[PDB]
Amino acid sequence: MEALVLVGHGSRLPYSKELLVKLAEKVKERNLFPIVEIGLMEFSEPTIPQAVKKAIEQGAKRIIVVPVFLAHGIHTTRDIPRLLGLIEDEIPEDVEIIYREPIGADDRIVDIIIDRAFGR
Amino acid sequence: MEALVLVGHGSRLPYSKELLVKLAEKVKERNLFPIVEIGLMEFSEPTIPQAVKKAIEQGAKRIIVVPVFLAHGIHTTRDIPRLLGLIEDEIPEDVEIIYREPIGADDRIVDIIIDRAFGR
Ligand code: NI
Ligand code: NI
Numbered sequence: 001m002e003a004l005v006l007v008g009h010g011s012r013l014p015y016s017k018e019l020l021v022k023l024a025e026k027v028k029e030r031n032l033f034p035i036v037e038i039g040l041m042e043f044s045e046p047t048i049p050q051a052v053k054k055a056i057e058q059g060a061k062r063i064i065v066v067p068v069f070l071a072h073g074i075h076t077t078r079d080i081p082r083l084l085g086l087i088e089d090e091i092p093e094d095v096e097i098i099y100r101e102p103i104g105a106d107d108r109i110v111d112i113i114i115d116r117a118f119g120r
Numbered sequence: 121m122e123a124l125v126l127v128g129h130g131s132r133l134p135y136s137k138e139l140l141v142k143l144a145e146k147v148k149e150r151n152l153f154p155i156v157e158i159g160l161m162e163f164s165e166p167t168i169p170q171a172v173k174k175a176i177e178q179g180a181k182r183i184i185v186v187p188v189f190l191a192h193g194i195h196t197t198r199d200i201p202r203l204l205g206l207i208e209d210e211i212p213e214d215v216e217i218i219y220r221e222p223i224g225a226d227d228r229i230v231d232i233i234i235d236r237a238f239g240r
Binding site: 107 | 124126128131132133135136138139142143146147150152153184186188189190191192193194197220221222223224225226227228229230231232233234236237239
């Protein structure tokens, strides 16, 4: 009855969708969620509305939307909550959208940065 | 002799620079680097050229540039390597720039995503 929907920026290059895809597969490997979908905000399919619809059609009533972004910006504060109809201007009927928080300045990010700095 | 320069997208909102700042402070807390600076690609100061110059002025000869981005895109593949003069068409002379890789689909990111999914 819960779905994880991972949402990404999307690009004209393919690396953004590749990332969402690898992440979704990695969370699928962890067996924690009934349903797991990805959506991209601009330029790529699936789109965020499509991903949400797909999760409802598989029978989820609680949709957990996690924005896979480092920081808040225009997309996480306006565009995405719009697309999800959480803010005025698709149609869910009797499900609840749970819009989570971006990655932010997590200690794990600093771990990744130090590794990356040393080429690991 | 080595500097870490963390580079971010930058935004018209403040959250992007806030993130770089928190990250830089967190890597400062770990005492691993002689010198640590941040740069933002668009809309914010310091800029990437400024951050690089600032690191040279403090006496670094090896500048480690880490792009704090989830995925490769136009900025990490063209704009940033341009700004750093790694790519034809930004005044080092006897120092070397070491341009690292973005975060990518790291297992740590999946940890953060699951936490974020549960509102932690
Ligand atoms: Ni954008
Ligand atoms: Ni951009």
